[PDB]
């Protein structure tokens, strides 16, 4: 087999467009949002420090512009699949799972409780399998042996 | 010349082949009778009449 060094990190279609979008539910981000992010229409705040913006908040073109102008430093936001990969790498599976368990110990509402449980199971399974989320985004692309795509 | 299975007639509701066999046998009977009257070379008149 061969491989290609991709210059811009590209998202793996299967983990986005498959009816359950596993990037989306892992990141608890709707599909339309991730779509808008990859196609370069809006930014997302990656660790926006002691500011007025959350960590999975989308910013439009000129809202990001007015913010950067106002918040030059201590403000990390980006666009595209590399932004998605970056925010994916930084998310702490185990600690967030423990938070979820604390919520389960404190939270008493039927449907919300069920949803919480579902997420808890999902994360548990992921961290048990041993796959790190950042791999859903491809950096190197393998190329099939020539004889199987003959000329 | 050919031996055809009878059990194919009644359940295969194509009965026309049987009438075809009968009428064709009759046609060859005529043909034979003419062959006989010609082999003896009877006369124009008799072939004509028949």
């Amino acid at each position: 087999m061969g491989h290609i060094e991709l210059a811009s990190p590209t998202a793996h279609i299967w983990f986005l467009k498959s009816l359950p979008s596993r990037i989306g539910l892992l990141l608890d981000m709707p599909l339309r949002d991730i779509e808008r992010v990859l196609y370069f229409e809006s930014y997302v705040v990656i660790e926006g420090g002691m500011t007025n913006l959350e960590r999975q908040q989308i910013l439009t073109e000129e809202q990001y512009l007015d913010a950067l102008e106002e918040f030059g430093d201590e403000f990390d936001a980006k666009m595209g699949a590399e932004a998605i990969q970056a925010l994916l790498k930084s998310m702490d599976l185990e600690q967030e799972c423990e938070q979820l368990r604390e919520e389960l110990n404190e939270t008493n509402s039927e449907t919300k409780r069920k949803k919480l449980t579902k997420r808890i199971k999902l994360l548990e399974a992921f961290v048990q399998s041993g796959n790190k989320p950042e791999w859903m985004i491809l950096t190197v692309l393998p190329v099939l042996p020539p004889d199987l795509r003959p000329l | 010349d050919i031996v055809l299975n009878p059990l194919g007639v009644p359940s295969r509701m194509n009965i026309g082949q049987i009438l075809e066999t009968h009428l064709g046998m009759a046609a060859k009977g005529i043909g034979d009778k003419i062959n006989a009257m010609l082999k003896q070379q009877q006369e124009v008149a008799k072939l004509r009449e028949f």
Binding site: - | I2, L4, N5, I18
Partner: protein, 49 residues
């Protein structure tokens, strides 16, 4: 086609199913022998050798 003398009867299960029994007499007279004209082509190309 051609018109043959047929007899409707079972002849020791060789016409068991829709199969047909036939006499050497038909093949002897060559009345069901077909001529088939087939075409063959040999093409000589030039390889780089």
């Amino acid at each position: 086609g051609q018109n043959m003398r047929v007899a409707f009867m079972p002849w020791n299960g060789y016409n068991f199913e829709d199969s047909i029994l036939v006499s050497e007499r038909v093949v002897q007279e060559d009345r069901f022998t077909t001529i088939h004209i087939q075409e063959l082509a040999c093409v000589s190309r030039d390889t780089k050798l």
